[PDB]
């Protein structure tokens, strides 16, 4: 679950400080702007991630309530089909 | 109707009294589907008594 | 209430970087990586804080998360989907009500005892 990406996170991260830190006098503008435009594009994905945890915690148990009523409407709707059907397999 | 199932119709089997029969069979139906829709689905009597009142018919 | 603000701090620190590093770089940009690890590292930590209750997560929410947007619109079709069945709810009360309207008139037009037994005895 959480542990897959937080360790693909981590190797990435260690990768990118590898890269970036040892082979520092190896790199050319076009690197380096390439480099820019990835730490850009995580940062977004950071802050869209971060945004999306937000939103799950202002409304951690607002969720779980709404997905058990969903839930119960689900089940009494199955439950109304079903009579409905028998009642009109048996009339 | 007095042997086999349970006993509901009389010795008289009339057209009137099998009539009546069915709608108090049906009426029973309709109150066990209305306190299962507003109550709550963990009542099957409707289903017995459906059977009930197709083997009184039979 | 110390963990959104580290995490809004360590938010507005990765934006600042990001507009200083602007320009090019030559020094070693470790603030806007440590700034995406602390970042990684509270919202690792806000998601275990909300699975320690244990709850029964659906597929639905992985799938909305990968979506891009928030659980806003799916509580605002979870609203819809309520009334819905509020008024499918209503629409059946008023056709098993017709119905029972229509079975003790035929009772009445049919047999009297039915319809004194369920009048007086029930």
Redesign the interface.
């Known amino acids: 679950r959480l542990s897959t990406l937080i360790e693909f996170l981590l190797h990435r991260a260690y990768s990118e400080l590898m890269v970036l830190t040892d082979l520092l006098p190896r790199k050319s503008d076009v690197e380096r702007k390439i480099e820019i435009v990835q730490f850009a594009s995580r940062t977004r994905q950071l802050f869209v991630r971060l945004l999306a945890l937000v939103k799950w915690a202002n409304d951690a148990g607002k969720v779980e309530k709404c997905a058990m009523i969903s839930s119960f409407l689900d089940?009494?709707a199955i439950?109304?089909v079903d009579?409905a059907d028998?009642?009109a397999s048996?009339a | 109707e007095s042997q086999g199932i349970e006993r509901l119709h009389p010795m008289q089997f009339d057209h009137?009294k099998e009539?009546?029969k069915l709608?108090?069979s049906?009426?029973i139906n309709?109150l066990d589907?209305?306190d299962?829709?507003?109550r709550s689905?963990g009542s099957i009597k409707?289903?017995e008594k459906?059977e009930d009142l197709?083997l009184l018919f039979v | 209430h110390l963990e959104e603000h580290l995490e809004k701090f360590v938010e507005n620190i990765r934006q600042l970087g990001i507009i200083v590093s602007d320009f090019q770089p030559s020094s070693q940009a470790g603030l806007s990586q440590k700034l995406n690890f602390i970042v990684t590292g509270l919202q690792d930590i806000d998601k275990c804080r909300q699975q320690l209750h244990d709850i029964t997560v659906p597929l639905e929410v992985f799938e909305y998360i990968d979506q891009g947007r928030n659980p806003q619109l799916y509580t605002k079709e979870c609203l819809e989907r309520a009334l819905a069945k509020n008024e499918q709810v209503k629409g059946?009360?008023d056709t098993?009500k017709k119905?029972?309207s229509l079975?003790?008139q035929?009772?009445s037009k049919?047999?009297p005892?039915?319809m004194a037994?369920?009048r007086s005895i029930r």
């Open positions: 089940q009494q439950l109304f009579t028998r009642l048996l | 009137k009539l009546r709608n108090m049906i009426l309709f589907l209305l299962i829709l507003i689905p409707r289903e459906l197709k | 059946k009360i098993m119905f029972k079975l003790i035929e009772l049919v047999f005892e039915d037994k369920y």
